[PDB]
Structure formats: C-alpha cells, structure tokens
C-alpha cells in the first residue's frame, strides 16, 4: 500500500487532455499503410495556395459567377478607382470565404505577410497600367490616386506576363493580430487606381475583367484554436 494523495483536478473530463487509455480491442492487426499521393502535415500548406477572391460581392452578384470578376474599361479620364477593401483576412466579407480566410476562422491570432496576385483577362490587343497600393492604418481610406501613392504601391504594366504580385508585408505594433473585427489591431486598406488609361484598338472589346488570387507568404502563423462561426446545426441529421 503506497501512500498517495489526490490533488485538485481529479476525476474531471478535459476536452483537450493527453492521457493513455486501455484499448477495447486487444492485439488488433491494422491494415499496412499504402502510399496515397498528397499528404497534409500542416494546415499552413493548405493556406499557401491561391484562391479566387470575390471582390464584386455587391447586390445579387454573390448568387452569380460575376462576384469574382473586377470590371475595368476605357474612360475619358485617369486616376479613377478600380476597387478597394480593408485588410481583414478572417473577418472582411471579401476574404471570409477563401481557403486562407476559412482556415483563419478556426484560429484567434494570425501573423504574417499576404500575397495578392492579379491576372488580366482582356484581349491580347488591349494594354494598360494599374497602381496597386496598400495604406497602413492611422488616416482613413485614400480618396485619390495621389493620396494612395504615398503608401506602399506597385505599378503593374500589362504585357506578355498577365499576372502581377503585390506582397502586403507585416507592419504592426504587436506580434500578432486578431482574426475577429477589432479596432486596436487594425489592418490597413488595399486600393487599385488607373496609373494611365486602358488603350484598346478598333474591332476589339473595351470592357475587360481582372481576377484576384490571395495566399500567404512563408512567414504566416496562427494561434488559439476556436470554433468557426459559419456552421450551424439545428438538430442531429
């Protein structure tokens, strides 16, 4: 009879504990593993892949394939805004449904860089230049191409290589940010303007589209496992 003493925390059930337990089927021979292609070892390999972003999620576009498309055209001006949205990868309506955004909805903290790739989907005769800009929080959304230039920007020239990559870096005071909408840990703003104007010849379409893909860099991380707010079960199916 070895003398022992029970500490607080006995005979309790923890949703997240790591103990051994007696097997109910002793001396069971499992099937020998075969090599199935494409093994996942971490969730940050599912997040580093591109996913089309629904930027035009306005009105009834969400019930159509039109949501993904960004409409660009030829106008008698310059410096007009194409699109803009905030940098909230888990919470913004724009990113909530993408692979990386859905992965973030299972975590509380996120920290890293963000890649944004744009592919031009117009004619092979149409040409133009765009200004892709990222503005850090402190002063509101830039309302002009001139205010946007003062922030991190990339001038994209459409040619043989249709795609372009704007890499939003980690500028934060803290080490991590909040996936949920918060005001202390604010993200920034991402806007797109016309660096020049869309140039189209005759007998070609002057109304084109762009597509946007979002992924993570090699320095992305997440923490605090939680429950996604998206799924809802009325009753046992």
């Amino acid at each position: 009879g070895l003398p022992t003493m029970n500490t607080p925390g006995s005979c309790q059930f923890l949703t997240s504990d790591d103990f051994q337990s007696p097997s109910a089927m002793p001396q069971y021979d499992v099937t020998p593993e075969m090599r199935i292609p494409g093994e996942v070892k971490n969730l940050m390999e599912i997040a580093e892949v591109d996913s089309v972003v629904p930027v035009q999620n306005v009105g009834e576009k969400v019930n159509s394939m039109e949501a993904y498309q960004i409409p660009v055209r030829s106008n008698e001006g310059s410096g007009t805004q194409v699109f803009g949205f905030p940098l909230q990868p888990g919470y913004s309506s724009v990113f909530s449904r993408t692979l990386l955004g859905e992965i973030l909805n299972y975590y509380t903290h996120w920290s890293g860089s963000i890649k944004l790739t744009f592919m031009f989907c117009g004619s092979a005769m149409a040409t133009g230049k765009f200004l892709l800009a990222y503005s850090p929080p402190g002063a509101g959304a830039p309302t002009k191409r001139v205010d946007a230039m003062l922030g991190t920007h990339v001038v994209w020239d459409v040619g043989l290589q249709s795609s372009c990559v704007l890499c939003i870096p980690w500028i934060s005071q803290t080490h991590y940010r909040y996936v949920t909408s918060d005001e202390y840990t604010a993200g920034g703003f991402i806007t797109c303007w016309y660096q020049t104007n869309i140039v189209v010849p005759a007998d070609a379409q002057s109304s084109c589209y762009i597509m946007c893909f979002v992924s993570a860099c090699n320095d992305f991380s997440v923490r605090l496992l939680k429950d996604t707010p998206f799924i809802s079960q009325q009753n046992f199916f």
Partner: protein, 57 residues
C-alpha cells in the same frame, strides 16, 4: 524503460513518459511533429520555374 523528451517552451525543460499498455493504440497523441512540405500543393509544375526569370519566355 522511460523516454525523456523536451517540453514546449517559448523562445527569446525535459519531461518523462512511460507506456503502461501493450497495444500501441493506447499511447498519447503525437503533438510534437513539426514537418512541412508545401512543394506538392504550391509549385506543382514539371519544369522548375525560377523566381527572377520570366514565367513564359
């Protein structure tokens, strides 16, 4: 026959573990398995694409 391993600590300790069953499906989970290989999902092409060079030349 006990196994001594490292604890999960912050950056900028050892712990002991013994197996009490003979089933290999009774042990604790494998939480410290930090191995990644995203070259399957990302960059799944045949001809290697260098970053600096153009994609289609």
């Amino acid at each position: 026959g006990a196994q001594v391993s490292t604890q999960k600590t912050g950056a900028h300790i050892h712990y002991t573990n013994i197996n009490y069953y003979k089933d290999a499906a009774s042990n604790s989970a494998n939480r410290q398995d930090f191995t990644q290989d995203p070259g399957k999902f990302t960059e799944p092409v045949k001809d290697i694409m260098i970053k600096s060079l153009p994609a289609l030349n």
